């Protein structure tokens with residue numbers, strides 16, 4: 582099935598910058614969430630999980646249809662906690678009821694990355710809501726207890742190569758694992774609501790110990806109070822991934838540029854953009870607007 586991008590009727594860049602801005606202003610205001618981490622990280626994860634159900638083989642799942650709004654997908658165990666990002670976006674959607682669900686979930690992720698001082702992420706509109714029966718089944722999002730071979734094979738289904746996977750994993754600088762949500766506990770670093778290449782630096786430079794958490798799952802822990810999932814740690818066990826981790830640990834601009842591309846791609850899998858669709862938008866941050 583082909584999903585053709587269809588611009589919300591009569592809308593243009595300024596309309597979407599207003600939605601961006603409303604998201605960004607609420608991100609600034611609602612700062613208490615998650616022990617003052619704020620909503621940035623969970624909004625990035627929401628964009629990823631709403632996109633990461635995609636299957637390149639048959640074009641099922643993906644960001645286009647905004648299917649997270651249906652109970653099968655919002656109750657996926659893999660999505661535990663993302664309801665906080667959805668609830669954040671509710672008043673945004675009420676103010677701007679013309680935006681599609683897929684466009685709002687993906688735009689929330691773009692807005693969060695940029696407001697957290699991350700790279701610019703070009704973003705295209707035109708996702709169209711699809712019906713409840715187009716919601717993908719549970720089980721398309723990845724397990725965390727696995728090795729590098731798992732990670733590599735997993736991401737082939739999303740048409741991501743080694744560089745794209747290692748870049749995308751850099752988003753694990755953000756936020757934290759929560760025991761009751763995933764069976765893992767702890768942040769990956771100190772700067773967890775500012776977008777940096779810290780994930781790579783910590784992988785290479787902390788002294789990691791393989792421990793069991795209070796849910797009886799293994800994770801890697803450091804004396805600084807940081808953690809890595811087994812799938813994170815797999816990026817330094819596999820020699821191909823390791824080379825790329827070192828590259829991003831040593832070049833912040835390269836990480837930014839490669840993350841931006843990979844994240845846009847993730848958010849756009851499955852969508853056909855007509856030849857005469859608008860160019861991708863690059864939104865100004867609040868800071869750049871003086872707001």
Ligand code: HEM
Pocket residue numbers: 622623625626629662723724725726732749750752753755756757758759760762763764765810812844
């Ligand atoms: C092998 C792939 C991946 C696995 C197994 C994985 C697993 C996890 C797990 C278990 C959590 C903790 C959830 C919780 O307890 O709250 C988490 C959090 C998070 N992940 Fe992933 N992840 C992967 C890839 C990605 C990608 C590709 C991105 C986005 C580009 C991403 C962004 C995030 C963010 C931002 C958080 C923090 C959420 C928060 O603080 O609420 N992850 N991930």
